[PDB]
Amino acid sequence: RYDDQLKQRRQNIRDLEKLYDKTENDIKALQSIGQLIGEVMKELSEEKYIVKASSGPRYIVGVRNSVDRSKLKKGVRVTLDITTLTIMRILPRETDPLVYNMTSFEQGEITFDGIGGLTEQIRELREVIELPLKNPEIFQRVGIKPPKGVLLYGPPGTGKTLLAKAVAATIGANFIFSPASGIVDKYIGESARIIREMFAYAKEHEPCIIFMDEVDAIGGRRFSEGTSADREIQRTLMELLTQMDGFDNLGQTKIIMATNRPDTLDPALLRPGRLDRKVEIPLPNEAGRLEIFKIHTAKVKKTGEFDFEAAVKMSDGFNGADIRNCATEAGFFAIRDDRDHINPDDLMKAVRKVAEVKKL
Amino acid sequence: LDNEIRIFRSELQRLSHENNVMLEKIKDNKEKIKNNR
Ligand SMILES: Nc1ncnc2c1ncn2[C@@H]1O[C@H](COP(=O)(O)OP(=O)(O)O)[C@@H](O)[C@H]1O
């Protein structure tokens, strides 16, 4: 009887030792007041560095005992106190997985790439890019210098983002990709820090491929007036070039870029020897469109027919990426007639609207 | 089992002292946070 009255107590106490340690933890943190964030321009001595805060100024500072003066160099991100302004700690890996993300299975060496439209391209990039990566100890002794970089231009609405994503995945290369928007959309004046990190991260995961679209955004002014307000639109080209020159072009890192307006490109660089090989790309033809429509339309409950042949012969003057719309241009009429298995009548009048959609 | 309650009441008298003690150090911190909140 008088045993259970105690047995609830050994439970009681341990149910407080948990509670206590928490309430004693937090006060152990509140004294540790906040800090301030900066970035470095250069270096002068182990007793004096330079910084650049995240609220303007370019202070001069010293440094604490603990942190290795070795790791402190240019480009690094930094933290320090508010009054004395002495640097203590570092945080690398300015993560932004919305920006980039790896494809490790792209290092599979047997991956699938069977969408339609284009064969000699995927055939030739295999020539342009495979050999300098797998056993490139020959390009030197033969004599030539391989291409540091590539460029892939064409018209819009063609679905090439998935292409370069694919062919580096069958070959067995570690693929990563980041648009040139968020690096200048999310990050107005803290951008090029991401660039160099995007390579160092890429280095120690060698070999690897790059891909990056909307590349015509780095230009901005392109020194359209030489005012000191577009330093972001200027330097963001600079750090790009200085870094890609630093590869040595050995055969464990290569680069891809793309846009629609190469005539709008910035040949201040990326023309002569950096993006040496320029490669245009075509549109479909009398059977490619069935090689395409066999992809999207195949993935939905139609009736099952081959009006494609008699269809595309009616089609002409036809870009590429309008095809996810063309099926769904018909899907918006099957449901209207309260259907499940559509007919080609929706397809025979599908484009009949879409051709006028190209007008504007 | 007479010696039971002459003994197993003693521990009960102890853990009450153990409980009210730990009950207060948390009350102490419980107020601190409000002072710094
Ligand atoms: N050859 C193709 N095969 C399959 N889908 C394609 C093809 N070309 C374009 N598309 C479609 O277009 C879209 C991708 O185009 P997108 O990547 O935006 O081109 P770009 O990168 O030139 O802007 C996808 O919805 C895709 O289904």
SS (H, E, C) chain A: CCCHHHHHHHHHHHHHHHHHHHHHHHHHHHCCCCCEEEECCCEEECCEEECEECCCCCCEEEECCCCCCCCCCCCCEEEECCCCCEEEECCCCCCCCCCCCEECHHHCCCCCCCCCCCCHHHHHHHHHHHHHHHCCCCHHHHCCCCCCCEEEECCCCCCCHHHHHHHHHHCCCCEEECCCCHHHHCCCCCCHHHHHHHHHHHHHCCCCEEECCCHHHCCCCCCCCCCCCCHHHHHHHHHHHHHHHCCCCCCCCECCCEECCHHHCCCCCCCCCCCCEEECCCCCCCCHHHHHHHHHHHHCCECCCCHHHHHHCCCCCCCCCCHHHHHHHHHHHHCCCCCCCECHHHHHCHHHHHHHHCCC
> Maximum CA pair distance of chain A?
95
Strands A277-279 and A150-153 turn out to be: parallel
Question: What distance in Å separates the CA atoms of residue A48 and residue A213, rounded to the nearest whole number?
Answer: 41
Phi-psi region of A82 (alpha: psi -120 to 50; beta: other; left: phi over 0): alpha
CB-CB contact of A31 with B37 (8 Å): no
Question: What distance in Å separates the CA atoms of residue A318 and residue A283, rounded to the nearest whole number?
Answer: 8
Residue type, A18: K
Buried residues in A21-38 as b, exposed as e (16+ CB within 10 A): eebeeeeeeeeeeeeeeb
Question: Shortest CA distance to A39 belongs to which of A53, A26, A49, A21?
Answer: A53
Question: What distance in Å separates the CA atoms of residue A86 and residue A78, rounded to the nearest whole number?
Answer: 10
Measuring CA to CA, how many Å separate A343 from each of A179, A289, A300? Answer: 39, 18, 12
- A132 within ligand 1 shell (Cβ under 6 A): no
| A101 CA to centre of ligand 1 in angstroms | 20
Cβ contacts (< 8 Å) between B26 and chain A: which residues? 16, 19-20, 23
- Nearest Cβ partner for A6 among B8, B32, B36: B8
Whether residues B26 and A9 touch (CB distance < 8 A) is answered with no
Question: What distance in Å separates the CA atoms of residue A45 and residue A68, rounded to the nearest whole number?
Answer: 13
- A282 within ligand 1 shell (Cβ under 6 A): no
Would you call A27 an interface residue with chain B, using a CB distance cutoff of 8 Å?
Answer: yes
CB-CB contact of A103 with A171 (8 Å): no
CB-CB contact of A82 with A35 (8 Å): yes
DSSP string across B1-37: -HHHHHHHTHHHHHHHHHHHHHHHHHHHHHHHHHHT-
Question: Shortest CA distance to A98 belongs to which of A197, A156, A33, A179?
Answer: A179
CB-CB contact of A53 with A36 (8 Å): yes
CB-CB contact of A128 with A147 (8 Å): yes
**Sheet-wide strand order for A258-259:** A258-259, A150-153, A277-279
| A325 CA to centre of ligand 1 in angstroms | 11
Residue type, A322: D
Of all protein residues, whose CA lies closest to atom 7 belonging to ligand 1? A159
Question: What distance in Å separates the CA atoms of residue A163 and residue A311, rounded to the nearest whole number?
Answer: 26
Best probe residue, ligand 1, of A324, A328, A329 (max atoms within 8 Å of C-beta): A324
Measuring CA to CA, how many Å separate A185 from each of A52, A235, A238, A334? Answer: 21, 16, 18, 40
Question: What distance in Å separates the CA atoms of residue A154 and residue A162, rounded to the nearest whole number?
Answer: 15
- A116 within ligand 1 shell (Cβ under 6 A): yes
**Which residues of A are annotated as part of the binding site for ATP?**
154-161
Gap between the terminal Cα atoms of chain B: 54
Return the half-sphere exposure (C-beta side, CA atoms, 13 A cut-off) of residue A156.
4
Method: cryo-EM
Question: What distance in Å separates the CA atoms of residue A254 and residue A149, rounded to the nearest whole number?
Answer: 6
- A208 within ligand 1 shell (Cβ under 6 A): no
Question: What distance in Å separates the CA atoms of residue A171 and residue A175, rounded to the nearest whole number?
Answer: 10
Residues facing A89 on adjacent strands: A79
| B30 CA to centre of ligand 1 in angstroms | 60
Residues 232 to 261 of A: which have CB under 8 A from any B CB? Answer: none
Residue labelled with tokens 């292409």? A163
- A179 within ligand 1 shell (Cβ under 6 A): no
Whether residues B12 and A12 touch (CB distance < 8 A) is answered with no
**Closest chain B residue to A12 measured between Cα atoms?**
B19
Of all protein residues, whose CA lies closest to atom 11 belonging to ligand 1? A321
Question: What distance in Å separates the CA atoms of residue A326 and residue A336, rounded to the nearest whole number?
Answer: 16
Structure tokens at A324: 């996810």
Residue type, B28: D
Question: What distance in Å separates the CA atoms of residue A137 and residue A154, rounded to the nearest whole number?
Answer: 33
CB-CB contact of B19 with A13 (8 Å): yes
Question: Shortest CA distance to A318 belongs to which of A326, A310, A330, A309?
Answer: A326
Buried residues in A154-182 as b, exposed as e (16+ CB within 10 A): beeebebeebbbbbbbbbbbbbbbbbbeb
Give the total residue count for chain A: 360
Strands A77-80 and A52-53 turn out to be: unpaired
Question: What distance in Å separates the CA atoms of residue A282 and residue A114, rounded to the nearest whole number?
Answer: 18
- A284 within ligand 1 shell (Cβ under 6 A): no
CB pairs < 8 Å spanning A and B: 41
Cβ contacts (< 8 Å) between B19 and chain A: which residues? 9, 12-13, 16
Structure tokens at A246: 């630093």
Question: What distance in Å separates the CA atoms of residue A153 and residue A279, rounded to the nearest whole number?
Answer: 6
Residue type, A68: D
Gap between the terminal Cα atoms of chain A: 88
Of all protein residues, whose CA lies closest to atom 14 belonging to ligand 1? A159
Return the half-sphere exposure (C-beta side, CA atoms, 13 A cut-off) of residue A339.
18
Best probe residue, ligand 1, of A162, A177, A215 (max atoms within 8 Å of C-beta): A162
Structure tokens at A134: 């797998």
Atom of ligand 1 nearest to the CA of A118: 1
